[PDB]
Amino acid sequence: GIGGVPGPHNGLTDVPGVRVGHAGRTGDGWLTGVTVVLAPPGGAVAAVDVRGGGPGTRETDALDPRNLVQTIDAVVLTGGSAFGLDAAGGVAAWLEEQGRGFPVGADPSQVVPVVPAAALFDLGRGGTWRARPDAALGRAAVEAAAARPEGDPVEQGGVGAGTGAVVGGLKGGIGTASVVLDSGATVAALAAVNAAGSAVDPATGVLYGARTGLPGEFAGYGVPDAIGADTHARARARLAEAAEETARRRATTLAVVATDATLTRAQAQKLAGTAHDGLARAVRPVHLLSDGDTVFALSTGRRPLLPDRPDATAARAFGVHLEAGALNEVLAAGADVLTRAVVHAVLAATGVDTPGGVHPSYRELYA
Amino acid sequence: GIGGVPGPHNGLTDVPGVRVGHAGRTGDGWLTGVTVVLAPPGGAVAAVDVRGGGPGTRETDALDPRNLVQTIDAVVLTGGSAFGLDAAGGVAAWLEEQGRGFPVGADPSQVVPVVPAAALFDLGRGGTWRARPDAALGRAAVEAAAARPEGDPVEQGGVGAGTGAVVGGLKGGIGTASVVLDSGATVAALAAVNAAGSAVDPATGVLYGARTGLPGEFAGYGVPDAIGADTHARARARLAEAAEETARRRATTLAVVATDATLTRAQAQKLAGTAHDGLARAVRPVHLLSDGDTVFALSTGRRPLLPDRPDATAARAFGVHLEAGALNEVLAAGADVLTRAVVHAVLAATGVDTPGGVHPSYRELYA
Incomplete structure (x- = not known):
């Protein structure tokens, strides 16, 4: 069988045509940035599920399955809370220059890019309150995405x-993961992990999401799956004092899930919804009023959902429905890649220490 | 502090005034039933979140926050798939006889009960395909609820x-759990567990939901925390034997989460949504097209969200917001009690063997 393993680089760009670009500013009071997922020319079917209680979003109504524009070119994930939504304007400008957008006239240059965005709260964490992504930083991120090759490994961490x-x-960051289905379709996730809740079991120090991992995928990071009581106790103490200090100095998970399986917009909306179950398995608590958790789902529509002559082993819902059986595989994979991408984010992070926060990484505490 | 522990009986009726009624039919072709949650006189604020892709439901639109009838008296969970929604007519009939429902005339006897219901697929599991709940069985369930005292331990299992x-x-069933918040409010869940996916990690035999359990709460059921590789190899084979036999013979998780904290309908709707995160932590995959997963949330409105004596240790979102802080504790508890209620359902079950299916219990396989 060819399914049940990661794609070539175990990340979002294993979905062919998908590109990822990051732009950020660090130092001099700044600690923030923007991540852009850029669909291949011609766009991707897109949908969204906003599940956190305190979201900061742009253009999510345009992604409702009832609505006019079904495919889009770019999704924007940004720090700077609601202010950071300004970064999407820079991405819309770039798309316009590329002639990519919904056509609104006889002239092919006349397009209106639908650019959904969601933001996470990272204010003041570099030290400077008003240091937030803008249009220019948004443009830089999409230009970085465009300049990459197809199937290029995704950069993780800070x-x-x-x-x-x-x-x-703990320090969060970007994480990504992919899985190949038995049909040959790839499902993958990219997450910017900024949760109010914990990715770590408070009784043991174990990452909640780890048990969803595929064999050996986390070994590149070097953590013992046996964690000593004493190690965990020191870690709790270290985290507690970084938190107290952070508070004296100062005195949401955003994700894209993508597949090359052809989905309708309503099916991608259901995938964005099931991906949130993946988030729940990696972070607890989640979706609170303090979280703006949002998942965008994309389908490049390159592979049929179902092959031409299905076996007796083809998934069938109620033992009869081939299309539902195939979609159930994608949905379940969507949750799983998001769980795994959260773990990668947490393991890929390196700690920071700035005038607006001290945030050690998981590995600094446990590796 | 008094939070982070179960109420008196670790179940839904730890929320004062709530009553639970079961009625069922077993034997002679039958293996199905109805469970009714009955609010105290005057009703409870109610809301719903339907997240499975294959729901069978009644009166969910009436529970929208925008709508007329904000408080209800009973919620109906039923077997029989969509045919079993018939059970809710018997519950409405009883409520009308009691004078309980939305007033529609100057005459106190003129009421219309709003009785939301959701169904699970259990057809033919007793042997007879058309053996489904009907209005008589729903009436029997709500009559059973009314005859219980306040704070009655909830019956679990089949x-x-x-x-x-x-x-x-594996055999599923009814399970329940509660938790007390630092504020003294209680949050609790009751689940009828019928998932297409698994409560057990196929790699280890461990119940996914167990690590969310409160210490000791499962000690009564007599099952190991650590599962030997021999035991798991045996369990996996026994389950496959039962599945292959069931397939030869044949030729959704529904939950109510309740609290005595005063919630508005929109707040209860958020609680029904966060409870689904709890379901994801106990069952994988979940929310598939083959699952009609539905959570109803109820508030008896007996305790203000935040007291008049706000300690400096009271939860505050962003370090400032007391009400959002208090709501976040309820939301997070709603997930946890649902995860725990699922584990109780799996552990309380005893297996069945009928002409329509062979379904061993977890404990039969692993203890």
């Missing part, structure tokens, strides 16, 4: 929207 | 809507 991300007091 | 329930091929 980059793009993950630059100032913090997860339960 | 009863009510759980009678024919099966989770990943």
